Amino acid sequence: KGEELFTGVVPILVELDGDVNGHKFSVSGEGEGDATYGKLTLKFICTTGKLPVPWPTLVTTLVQCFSRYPDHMKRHDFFKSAMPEGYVQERTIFFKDDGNYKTRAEVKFEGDTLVNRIELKGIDFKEDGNILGHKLEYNYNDHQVYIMADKQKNGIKANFKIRHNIEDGGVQLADHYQQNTPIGDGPVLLPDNHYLFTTSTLSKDPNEKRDHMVLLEFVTAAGI
Numbered sequence: 001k002g003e004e005l006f007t008g009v010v011p012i013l014v015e016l017d018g019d020v021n022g023h024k025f026s027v028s029g030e031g032e033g034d035a036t037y038g039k040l041t042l043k044f045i046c047t048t049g050k051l052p053v054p055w056p057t058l059v060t061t062l063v064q065c066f067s068r069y070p071d072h073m074k075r076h077d078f079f080k081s082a083m084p085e086g087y088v089q090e091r092t093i094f095f096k097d098d099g100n101y102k103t104r105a106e107v108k109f110e111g112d113t114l115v116n117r118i119e120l121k122g123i124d125f126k127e128d129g130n131i132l133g134h135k136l137e138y139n140y141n142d143h144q145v146y147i148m149a150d151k152q153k154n155g156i157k158a159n160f161k162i163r164h165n166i167e168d169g170g171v172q173l174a175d176h177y178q179q180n181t182p183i184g185d186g187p188v189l190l191p192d193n194h195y196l197f198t199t200s201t202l203s204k205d206p207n208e209k210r211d212h213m214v215l216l217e218f219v220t221a222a223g224i
Contacts, residue, residue: 001080001081002065002080002081002082002083002084003074003077003080003081003083005080005083005084005109006033006035006036006065006066006080006083007035007036008034008036009032009033009034010032010033010034010035010066010112010113010114011030011031011032011112011113011114012029012030012031012032012033012040012042012063012066012113012114012115012116013028013029013030013110013113013114013115013116014027014028014029014030014042014044014062014063014115014116014117014118015027015028015029015115015116015117015118016028016029016058016061016062016117016118016119016120017118017119017120018053018118018119018120018121018122019120019121019122020052020053020099020101020120020121020122020123020125020131020132021099021122021123021124021125021127021132023052023053023132024048025046025048025049025051025052026046026047026048027044027045027046027047027051027058027062028044028045028047029042029043029044029045029062029116029215030042030043031043031215033063033066033114034066035065035066035067035068035069035080036068037068037218038066038067038068038218038219038220039066039216039217039218040063040066040215040216040217040218040219041215041216041217042062042214042215042216042217043205043208043212043213043214043215044058044062044212044213044214044215045208045210045211045212046210046211046212047210049211050211051211052132053122053131053132053134054130054131054134054135054136054138054164055138055202055213056136056137056138056139056140056164056202057093057095057101057131057136057164057174058120058213059140059200059202059215060091060093060162060174060176061091061093061101061103061105061118061120062116062118062215063107063114063116064079064145064196064219065079065080065082065083065107065114066114066219067079067196067219067220067221068219068220068221069220069221070220070221070222072223073191073194073221073222073223075189076189076191076192076194076221077189077191077221078147078149078155078156078180078188078189078190078191079107079180081187081188081189082182082183082184082188083108083109083114084108084109085108085182085183085184085186086106086107086108086109086182086183086184087106087107087108087155087180087181087182087183088104088105088106088180088181088182088183089103089104089105089106089107089178089179089180090102090103090104090105090178090179090180090181091103091176091177091178091179092176092177093162093174093175093176093177094174094175094177095125095129095130095131095172095173095174095175096172096173096174096175097129098124098125098126098129098130098131098172099122099123099124099125099126099129099131100122100123100124101120101121101122102120102121102122103118103119103120103121104118104119105117105118105119106183108183130164130166130172131172135166135167135168136164136165136166136167136172137164137165137166137167138202139165139202140200140201140202141162141163141164141165142197142198142199142200143160143161143162143163143198144160144195144196144197144198145158145160145178145195145196145198146158146160146193146194146195147191147193147194147195147196147221148193149190149191149192149193150179150190151190153179153181154181154182154188154190155179155180155181155182155188155190156179156180156190156191157177157178157179157180158176158178159175159176159177159178160176160178161173161174161175161176162174162176192223194221194222194223194224195221195222195223195224196219196220196221196222197219197220197221197222198217198218198219199217199218199219200215200216200217201215201216201217202214202215203216
């Protein structure tokens with residue numbers, strides 16, 4: 001089982017290659033995950049200079065295999081079952097009254113490291129919008145994710161809203177559509193419908209001069 005790969009603390013690497021309205025950038029992340037409790041600790045750096053979008057808008061893009069699945073639904077865990085070969089994660093994220101991100105990621109083991117490697121393309125953004133104009137608060141409103149089996153593509157799908165607080169008022173909607181497909185050929189668990197519940201905290205490292213995001217996350221799976 002790929003679930004046996006997650007019984008202890010697992011190092012995490014994240015690499016993102018991004019292009020938003022031609023503004024190109026790279027993000028690296030590293031830290032660790034504990035799927036037994038559902039705990040993630042990561043620090044992300046924009047390695048090309050200043051991030052051209054707000055950090056909160058990248059949280060969902062930057063490893064649901066670390067969600068705590070209680071043992072009565074350790075059979076509904078598609079994400080771990082696809083390990084070590086991994087899975088592809090695709091999303092389109094529509095920002096209301098603004099542009100959209102399209103993301104393609106592969107999540108897999110490389111040695112003993114869980115790697116999330118991402119390509120992000122964003123188009124149709126307004127240069128003085130909430131995103132390219134950096135008008136979003138540095139905090140997070142999590143949202144449940146309702147995971148549905150997609151027997152047709154042998155993976156899962158989900159769609160959900162994320163709300164981003166706007167600096168001088170109101171809320172910026174980020175409409176997420178998601179599909180995951182295994183990379184390997186081996187068998188894969190296709191879940192009954194269930195929920196992922198996530199709690200994210202964003203902070204800064206006082207000794208880090210580069211543009212960055214420290215992220216601490218707790219996540220569990222739940223039925224019904």
